[PDB]
Design a protein around this ligand. Structure first.
Ligand SMILES: Cc1cc2nc3c(=O)[nH]c(=O)nc-3n(C[C@H](O)[C@H](O)[C@H](O)COP(=O)(O)OP(=O)(O)OC[C@H]3O[C@@H](n4cnc5c(N)ncnc54)[C@H](O)[C@@H]3O)c2cc1C
Ligand SMILES: NC(=O)c1ccc[n+]([C@@H]2O[C@H](COP(=O)([O-])OP(=O)(O)OC[C@H]3O[C@@H](n4cnc5c(N)ncnc54)[C@H](O)[C@@H]3O)[C@@H](O)[C@H]2O)c1
Length: 515
């Protein structure tokens, strides 16, 4: 028996374990298929893996001693340094004794009599616990392409989610499929190392510089001397990225100054900065979003010297959501050993034993094929586990027509269930979101321990209201008429208030059963 069983040992699962065990004296056990904490930062070790958020903000805020002790080597933190930080979090607080590694979760069945969950691992072992917190993160199963001939490639085949150890690049003809944030980071990292690189681009996207400069002793001292300060701005901001969230409209100024505002954010770096520190209407106004696109379009023309390759790298969408961040991505295509292949116009139809064959018939002889093709949505991480709640209804049937939840943390028909970084959550930096949700969930379990209650459940009507206020805000933006499987877009501050409006009104919209 346990009070809580944690599924996941990443950012969410680690702080969920710390809170329930140490701050509430509960008997908790965490599980993970991995052999070490980290989550996506343990699984994804591809070349160039780097955070969207800056180093001083992509961490935990609750441990003040850790913040003053934290290493800040560069403006953004690389994957090995994130794993080391999360390893130190597990070390300093002795969490590892309460996680069982190499242990997946097959089924999670809610018992309607004693009001607890039946969690069966993949080792034919099951445990019982009143509460089941689920910290599976946003990334799910790796969406690999459906290409004829995938099995016949005799060379190295790697998807970025399962990047193996000891991969050498020199002297090899390497091909990369996918031009997302993962594909961009791999391409800039390896193009200088390979004999020839081939980029199979299905859809071009906008990418801004990241500016990952080294941090000086004075820079790190300026941050740590003012750390209580930086975090208060995070809870008061909408994105939690430490940005000067602008309200100035794009078209309410001269073209000479509009170019100055874009160029300043272009020089400082960051995808969210170029979109939300510049002006405050890029994500709502059609004219504003066009202006931001043309600045990146103009930038693409200046860097890519070949106009035909520059035309290939230019996105064709009428509306653009959040761009990517890069450390010299458009600069890569100026090299003698880099070839861009518009795969939307020249699709891959077959890959033979030693090459990739596009529709035009050209065989692209590769020694190694990297798959940076992304993953599935957040619901896939849940649909992959046999979660049966009330009536024995499985998580696949209740979410068969898209995911939904109440405050992004609880589902109807699934009582005693609390989701960390679940669907219908806020669009912001993940560590502030995870800290916000683990605090809200834990204090509700504390209210549960004190008032002698054994079953909490959200109503079907509350999750309908929550999905209505999510579409309420979303339809104010062009994120519907663009690339966009649902999100709350009111900001971190409004999200912190909304769940406080619930936890103050005696948890309105939640069923509370006594025994
Ligand atoms: C390279 C990279 C950079 C990123 N940068 C940013 C950023 O700058 N800002 C940002 O906000 N987000 C970023 N993200 C998103 C990232 O997923 C967040 O950090 C996320 O919150 C990770 O925390 P988590 O523990 O909630 O998710 P995860 O770390 O994905 O936790 C999931 C864990 O649960 C385990 N698990 C799942 N199902 C089962 C099962 N059935 N049985 C056993 N174990 C299971 C998995 O093994 C996994 O370890 C980035 C992601 C990547 C890959
Ligand atoms: N913080 C960071 O910098 C960072 C790093 C990695 C990932 N992420 C997040 O994780 C998610 C993973 O995204 P990702 O970078 O893996 O890519 P993605 O999920 O954004 O998209 C996959 C990419 O592969 C390409 N692709 C997919 N199927 C294809 C096919 N059949 N043929 C050719 N091309 C194909 C698409 O054009 C797309 O650009 C992203 O949503 C991102 O937000 C963030």
């Amino acid at each position: 028996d346990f009070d809580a069983i944690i599924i996941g040992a990443g950012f969410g699962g680690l702080y969920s374990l710390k809170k329930l065990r140490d701050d509430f004296n509960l008997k908790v056990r965490a599980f993970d298929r991995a052999t070490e904490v980290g989550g996506t930062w343990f699984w994804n070790q591809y070349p160039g893996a780097l955070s969207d958020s800056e180093t001083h903000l992509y961490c935990y805020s609750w441990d003040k001693e850790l913040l003053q002790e934290m290493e800040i080597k560069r403006k953004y933190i690389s994957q090995p340094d994130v794993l080391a930080y999360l390893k130190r979090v597990a070390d300093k607080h002795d969490l590892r004794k309460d996680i069982q590694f190499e242990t997946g979760i097959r089924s999670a069945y809610f018992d309607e009599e004693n009001s607890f969950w039946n969690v069966t691992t993949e080792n034919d072992e099951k445990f019982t616990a009143r509460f089941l917190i689920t910290a599976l993160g946003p990334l799910a199963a790796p969406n690999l392409p459906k290409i004829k001939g995938i099995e016949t490639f005799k060379g190295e085949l790697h998807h970025t989610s399962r990047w193996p150890k000891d991969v050498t690049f020199s002297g090899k003809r390497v091909g990369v499929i996918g031009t997302g944030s993962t594909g961009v980071q791999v391409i800039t990292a390896i193009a200088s190392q390979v004999k020839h690189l081939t980029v199979f681009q299905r859809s071009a996207q906008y990418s801004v510089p990241i500016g990952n400069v080294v941090m000086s002793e004075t820079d790190v001292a300026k941050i740590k001397e003012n750390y209580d300060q930086i975090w208060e701005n995070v809870w008061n901001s909408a994105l939690g990225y430490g940005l000067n969230e602008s309200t100035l409209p794009t078209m309410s100024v001269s073209a000479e100054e509009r170019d100055k505002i874009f160029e300043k954010a272009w020089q400082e770096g960051g995808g969210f900065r170029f979109m939300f520190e510049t002006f405050g209407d890029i994500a709502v106004d059609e004219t504003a979003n066009i202006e931001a696109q043309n600045f990146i379009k103009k930038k693409i023309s200046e860097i890519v010297k070949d106009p035909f390759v520059a035309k290939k790298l230019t996105p064709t969408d009428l509306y653009a959501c959040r761009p990517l961040c890069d450390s010299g991505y458009y600069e890569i295509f100026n090299r003698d050993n880099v070839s861009l292949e518009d795969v939307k116009a020249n699709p891959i139809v077959e890959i033979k034993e030693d090459c990739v064959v596009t529709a035009d018939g050209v065989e692209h002889k590769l020694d190694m094929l990297i798959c940076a093709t992304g993953f599935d949505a957040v619901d896939g991480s849940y649909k992959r586990i046999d979660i049966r709640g009330k009536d024995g209804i499985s998580i696949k049937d209740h979410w068969k027509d898209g995911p939904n939840s109440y405050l992004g943390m609880m589902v109807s028909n699934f009582p005693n269930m609390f989701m960390v970084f679940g669907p219908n959550g806020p669009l912001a930096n993940s560590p502030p979101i995870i800290e916000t949700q683990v605090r809200w969930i834990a204090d509700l379990i504390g209210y549960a321990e004190d008032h002698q209650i054994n079953q909490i459940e959200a109503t079907k009507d509350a999750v309908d209201n929550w999905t209505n206020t999510c579409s309420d805000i979303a339809n104010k933006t062009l994120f519907a008429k663009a690339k966009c499987v649902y999100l709350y877009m009111g900001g971190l501050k409004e999200y912190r208030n909304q769940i406080s409006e619930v936890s103050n009104n005696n948890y309105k919209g939640c069923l509370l059963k006594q025994s």
